[PDB]
């Protein structure tokens, strides 16, 4: 209900500590293009129904906008603004050279089915077909969508435009010119934080204890990727409960036995409960689970030197300003989940390019970039005695800022 | 059929002690062909044992032999097997939540393809079976390996297949036509909350349940301050 | 009391009466594109200041959507998906091959500067260049906008275009590709409306005992156009009341140069009667004044054998449904003011051709259509034995009820 | 199997009898841009199907190329070819801005289904989408096609383009931009090729007789044509038999009682069959039904001065060879039944303009433009002792002759 | 015997083994366009020539079309769609972001002049301007064409398109944006496919006691490259017979200056063997002198533990079984022969980039891609336990059908 009046909030602090006058976050506040579609769809039934999209553009002077597509029914108007703002503030920290985008539809999957799901992705780019494009508009999936949307989305706008235009699109199919490394992107981001960071603080990655709170894709890359770097996995969690071991946990044992949910934990065993699981003793926590987990009452039980927020909002503001009062390093979510937006601006490039990449080089490049923004923002919030939330907000506000000066719109 | 005694002495025990709760002084009450009030289809089958020619087993002690394992989507060429063996879903336990769920409904893959049937019917039970099995040949023939047969969407004019019976019935119907192993069984129904149930649709062909009744009334009961443990952890 | 659920009910009731399915009535009861954009303007004294533009298309089935523009602060989306609306249902009881549209903007001219005015224009052309076009969305002026407005959004256009396009908007001057007849367009319009309907019925136009509640703009306009012909029996509503009341007698032509800021047309102290006279045996009655003026009181109390509506919303439902029962012939104000939008697309008609009518062409086809239309309405009311409002209606959305249909959305 | 190398035969003789080089004749002989597609369309049972079409553009010297598409399992491209040529003679004979154009799909509308056909169009449309237009190529209706289908096509360009298109088919209802006319444009046509026909010989059509074979809409429209003209109608036929009345037949009666189909015959009262029916006493006779009906043997029993081909290819060249013996006036099909080809050009124009003209306006073009035809045709063949096929052969293949040298393609 | 169908016979034997339905088959063995123009040319004499030109495209499901034109008088539609087929295989299993595509034209270089050919180019860019471009289907050269043809074009359709389009063509001089390596990148191939060879079997580069049936052209090269490292058995096949047999013997280097249509390296009356020796007890051989120079005779009597065929079906299936059967490695054509497709795909993505890299960088990509290929296959081939022939075209047809399936057409 709030989300929107949070986002204008954050944004006119940025903006305040950054020094920029009114009319920026005049302009900011809102973005200067939102549409409005009704989809016809023909159903299994016979039946048509109308169904309700939402196209939202927050800004265009750094690039083309960057946005997801999300298949909800609870999704507004208001919700999409908010998202297309912090897509915008995520390739600002990235350094992209995107605007802000998002895109939703009013609709439930789950009762949808197969051709339903293509018909009505085929209408919403048909609706949407005048305001996007490679140049204009890029999509990408988020709730309830995947690489078989993303294909139909694609050959509608090939389909209407004549030719091929795989970088219209973005979290397609290899074979349809998707990237390597979409599935490790979020992953590979939050190591690379949790190395800077340990890093800065003088804690020595060979040996580190890291506490990993959900064990999805997510959470087993990571996990991988920490095991090999050489750090200890002292905990992890799942959907049944947790397991603790000082020493290690064999997560090449815990992979292979991994399901499809990721799922690890034994029939007859007693588990961990992710309360407790929370306050273990560690140098490293990673959140990638479901959010509201760090409050008052356990924000001094946490023992971890570092926080990573993997998931969205895994933290509350009492809880940061207690682990900023504990001298603890909090890495935003905004920073440390921006590997699967960098991925898709490294598959636009090879679109463009129409060369594409391998594993090693995807790797490389998205090192390079997180290490660079995570260092800004930490000169920033060293310079600045504020937090690397608020600083993140500032590096991702001062570009499109900067930007809107410079073309004259303010 | 749900009663307040089948929840606050099976469902709530269940969450407390983590195991199916104890009981003394076995059935004196009659079977079902004998009760005169209705009873579910569960209730006519009972479940057999190792008596003599084969011991039972300890799974506790002995869990290093036992495997939940299941394998959810199409079968590859046994006799000449590549990769395409285990391009499928592989689950640790065959009770799949409402997120799990909604997840497999979702998944949209075109190699991994999903079909929901609606097991209700008015008067005709064998024609409601028959476009059970009509649509479901309908999905394999498009390429869906995932069949979901639904008890929702039942109001007093349409009343939901017995469960059991609606499973069991696909699944013989399947094997003779050389149709089961590109498939698997989801079933969605709320006359599912105990192991029998359970024990009795897995045994019968069912890959995989839900039991979104029982969670809702978890859900209730949580909400209405019984049952402080959260929803995820019931 | 809401516009928007008004309009939604009326096209309900057309549907229905037309028997139509309800996914018809899903369909066109909103806008299928609704465009909301931020114009940053620069203004005269060196600040920027953020205008809030609407755009909306309600049905591109039958053609591209023509719409008007007003700069009001007051303007709202449900307000613009209203008119967007009923500028359907006017093109489809002419029978024009257009759509629903309208725009609108948050500002005040009153206080906006010219130079500011043109920037505003200019900024909005520029946020809806992609959704609209000579062959997508051709706007026009309303209220608080005029050929000046019209002429710097042509420009702009043809700029962004690279060539001419007088086509893209109408409402222009003379020399940018203006047409003949803008001016008298709604009061000839009406005029033939009555003229028509007399001719249906048994009265002529010598005696003509004419009823007004106007004397501005355009009642002065069709009570000097009967004045050749027919005769008069009471004005009222002169904006200071029964000021006129010949009661039987003629008035002396006089609209060579006088307007009601200074008097009325002689003296402003002359006798007066009272705010409300109507009643007397007339023959013809307009009604323009202010909004539900005939009330459900009054309703028998009238005894013009002919009553055509000039104004919006001048009476309602209890009331025209008096009047049917009664058997007096009751014009709808929808078909009544046509003509601007009959004269905006033979405008348009001029711009693709590239040959420009005269008055009299114009005047022509403009009686054509209009005469078409009420011969069209009046015939299918007395087939289906209901009132000349609800036939409109049911005229209006039949043509893209089937559009739709045939087209496949529905 | 031979349609290809008679059409290219009767190129040849026109283009030696004009005295064009060889060089025009190996330009005309084959279309300059034939196209083959393969469209996959998902069925109602869910399987797939890869259907095979073909679009022909003869020329386009002269101006876009006008064309039909049919439904048919017989379609080739030598057909198509053939069919697009004799278009382009067809443009060439009423002086149309047209070329030469003919689409043609594998399929069995018998077997599809409401959904299928519509599917199949959009692939059709999206297929050839490259290549046609309102500028380029413009399709209509043939065998197995109706306004339906036209209007799927034209939803299809329109969705591709983004912007509507009328003009890049023609064929649709009237709400979505088609023209009066469309239904009695062939018998309209024949009418005035008869009305000239018989100014020419001195046959006054007051009292004139003339037996019709074919009561279609064709027929019917012709015959009450005559009637209206004071013409009497001796003879009609059916599908099962025909009626004979030297004093006149009843046609308003007869249209009365005709059904959807066309039957006027009792069902216990003998007919006339049409063997006998061609041979009646009468001035003009008028087959408008299925082919190869005069050979020799009733070419000399043929009593009717001058005989007009409504249908297509209703006459050998036997019996054209008899009948100029006996010197009777021979009206053929490919001027004859070019009222459709000239009511989809009005639409075209109509579409262009945006502006729709009327059921009299549409009668006195088609009228002077079929008189202009008929009379330059006439000219030729009077002034080379040749026959009326012949001559308008010459006529169409001399436009987009000169139109080519012009250009310089040859 | 026809090539078509023995294409439709391979993709289809390809598929089954693949385990696709039958629709997959059905859509990917005739190309879903083919398009058939004629070009006016104006000769030298001043007469005008009208020539016949195809181009097909196969699918576009995983990119634009990549097909080479060849003028040749002897080209046909069924030849024009099977090497489409072809170019669609190569393209698939190097991985590429193309489809297939194909061109010709009727004609005889010889014969025609430089003006005519320039002439000729250009109306077959005018003709086939509307379904080609950079994003569509690109262009390259084919027996008798060359840069000089491929800048004509890119002219050409640069006047067309209003703007440079150096990536519409490949095989461009330098100076109009051409790459480097396009000379030897067949060879480059082939020597990359020999390396990657030996390296898997235990064969070394030292010894490589080398057959070839070449010593023309690529042949000598091949050679040249191997004398570097390896040793040379005996040479055959140099247009003349076995006029090369050192058995045992290395070859100075005399790549200098030296053609075979002048002796073939030193003097055409050397000592002469015979036409046909083959057999010795070699480790690498390269037969490419003719089509099918081994066959079930002969099948057994090779001795080469390693087979790469440089030429177009130079083995049959019962060899190749025999060879599998045996053990010998066989590296298929098709896989062979594509450093000319890779070389021209650089020069796309230089084109696209508007940066040209240098040689080193282009071998060092070849590599890569190349060995990058032959893994998988080699890989693919021992998982299946078949041939890798085979192998290669089910790696070749997975993308495209993976790409079909994914965009929903089947």
Same mark, same amino acid.
């Given at each position: 209900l709030?989300?929107?009046?949070?986002?204008?909030?954050?944004?006119?602090?940025?903006?305040?500590?950054?020094?920029?006058?009114?009319e920026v976050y005049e302009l900011l506040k809102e973005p200067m293009r939102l549409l409005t579609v009704k989809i016809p769809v023909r159903m299994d039934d016979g039946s048509v129904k109308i169904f309700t999209g939402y196209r939202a553009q927050h800004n265009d002077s750094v690039g083309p906008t960057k946005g997801g597509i999300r298949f909800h029914p609870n999704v507004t108007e208001k919700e999409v603004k908010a998202l297309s703002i912090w897509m915008s503030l995520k390739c600002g920290i990235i350094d992209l050279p995107y605007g802000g985008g998002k895109g939703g539809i009013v609709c439930d999957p789950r009762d949808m089915s197969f051709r339903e799901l293509e018909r009505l992705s085929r209408g919403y780019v048909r609706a949407i077909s005048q305001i996007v494009g490679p140049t204009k508009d890029v999509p990408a999936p988020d709730v309830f969508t995947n690489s078989q949307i993303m294909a139909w989305m694609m050959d509608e706008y090939s389909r209407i435009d004549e030719f091929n235009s795989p970088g219209f699109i973005?979290?397609?199919?290899?074979?349809?010119?998707?990237?390597?490394?979409?599935?490790?992107?979020?992953?590979?981001?939050?190591?690379?934080?949790?190395?800077?960071?340990?890093?800065?603080?003088?804690?020595?990655?060979?040996?580190?204890?890291?506490?990993?709170?959900?064990?999805?894709?997510?959470?087993?890359?990571?996990?991988?990727?920490?095991?090999?770097?050489?750090?200890?996995?002292?905990?992890?969690?799942? +959907?049944?409960? $947790?397991?603790?071991?000082? =020493? &290690?946990?064999? !997560?090449?044992?815990?992979? %292979?036995?991994?399901?499809?949910?990721?799922?690890?934990?034994?029939?007859?065993?007693?588990?961990?409960?992710?309360?407790?699981?929370?306050?273990?003793?560690?140098?490293?926590?990673?959140?990638?689970?479901?959010?509201?987990?760090?409050?008052?009452?356990?924000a001094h039980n946490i023992r971890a030197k570092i926080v990573v927020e +993997?998931?969205? $909002?895994?933290?509350?503001? =009492? &809880?940061?300003? !207690?682990?900023?009062?504990? %001298?603890?390093?909090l890495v935003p979510d905004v920073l440390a989940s921006a590997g699967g937006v960098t991925v898709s601006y490294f598959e636009w490039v090879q679109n463009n390019q129409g060369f594409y990449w391998s594993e090693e080089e995807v790797e490389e490049?998205?090192?390079?970039?997180?290490?660079?923004?995570?260092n800004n923002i930490y000169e920033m919030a060293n310079n600045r005695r504020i937090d690397m939330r608020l600083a993140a907000y500032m590096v991702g506000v001062r570009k499109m800022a900067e930007a809107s000066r410079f073309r004259g719109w303010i | 059929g749900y009663t307040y005694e089948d929840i606050q002495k099976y469902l709530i025990p269940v969450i407390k002690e983590g195991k199916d709760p104890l009981g003394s002084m076995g059935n004196d009450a009659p079977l079902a062909v004998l009760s005169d009030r209705a009873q579910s289809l569960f209730n006519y089958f009972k479940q057999l044992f190792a008596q003599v020619t084969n011991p039972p087993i300890d799974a506790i002690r002995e869990q290093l032999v036992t495997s939940t394992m299941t394998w959810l989507g199409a079968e590859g060429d046994l006799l000449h097997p590549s990769e395409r063996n285990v391009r499928r879903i592989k689950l640790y336990t065959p009770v799949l939540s409402n997120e799990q769920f909604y997840a497999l409904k979702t998944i949209v893959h075109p190699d991994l393809k999903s079909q929901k049937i609606d097991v209700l019917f008015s008067e005709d039970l064998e024609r409601g079976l028959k476009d059970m099995f009509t649509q479901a040949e309908k999905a394999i023939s498009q390429g869906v390996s995932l069949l979901i047969?639904?008890?929702?969407?039942?109001?007093?004019?349409?009343?939901?297949?017995?469960?059991?019976?609606?499973?069991?019935?696909?699944?013989?119907?399947?094997?003779?036509?050389?149709?089961?192993?590109?498939?698997?069984?989801?079933?969605?129904?709320?006359?599912?909350?105990?192991?029998?149930?359970?024990?009795?649709?897995?045994?019968?062909?069912?890959?995989?349940?839900?039991?979104?009744?029982?969670?809702?009334?978890?859900?209730?009961?949580?909400?209405?301050?019984?049952?402080?443990?959260?929803?995820?952890?019931?």
């Open positions: 709030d989300v929107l009046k949070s986002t204008q909030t954050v944004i006119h602090k940025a903006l305040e500590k950054l020094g920029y006058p009114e973005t979290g397609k199919p290899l074979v349809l010119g998707g990237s390597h490394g979409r599935e490790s992107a979020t992953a590979k981001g939050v190591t690379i934080c949790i190395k800077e960071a340990a890093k800065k603080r003088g804690i020595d990655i060979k040996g580190a204890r890291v506490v990993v709170q959900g064990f999805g894709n997510a959470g087993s890359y990571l996990a991988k990727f920490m095991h090999d770097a050489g750090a200890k996995v002292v905990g992890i969690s799942d +959907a049944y409960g $947790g397991l603790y071991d000082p =020493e &290690g946990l064999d !997560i090449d044992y815990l992979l %292979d036995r991994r399901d499809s949910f990721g799922t690890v934990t034994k029939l007859f065993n007693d588990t961990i409960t992710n309360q407790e699981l929370l306050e273990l003793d560690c140098d490293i926590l990673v959140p990638a689970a479901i959010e509201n987990q760090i409050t008052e009452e356990n +993997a998931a969205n $909002g895994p933290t509350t503001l =009492e &809880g940061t300003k !207690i682990l900023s009062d504990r %001298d603890i390093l490049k998205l090192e390079k970039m997180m290490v660079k923004s995570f | 047969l639904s008890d929702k969407k039942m109001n007093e004019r349409l009343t939901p297949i017995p469960p059991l019976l609606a499973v069991s019935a696909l699944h013989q119907h399947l094997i003779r036509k050389g149709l089961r192993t590109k498939v698997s069984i989801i079933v969605e129904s709320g006359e599912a909350r105990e192991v029998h149930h359970f024990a009795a649709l897995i045994g019968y062909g069912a890959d995989a349940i839900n039991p979104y009744l029982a969670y809702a009334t978890y859900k209730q009961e949580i909400d209405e301050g019984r049952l402080d443990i959260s929803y995820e952890e019931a």
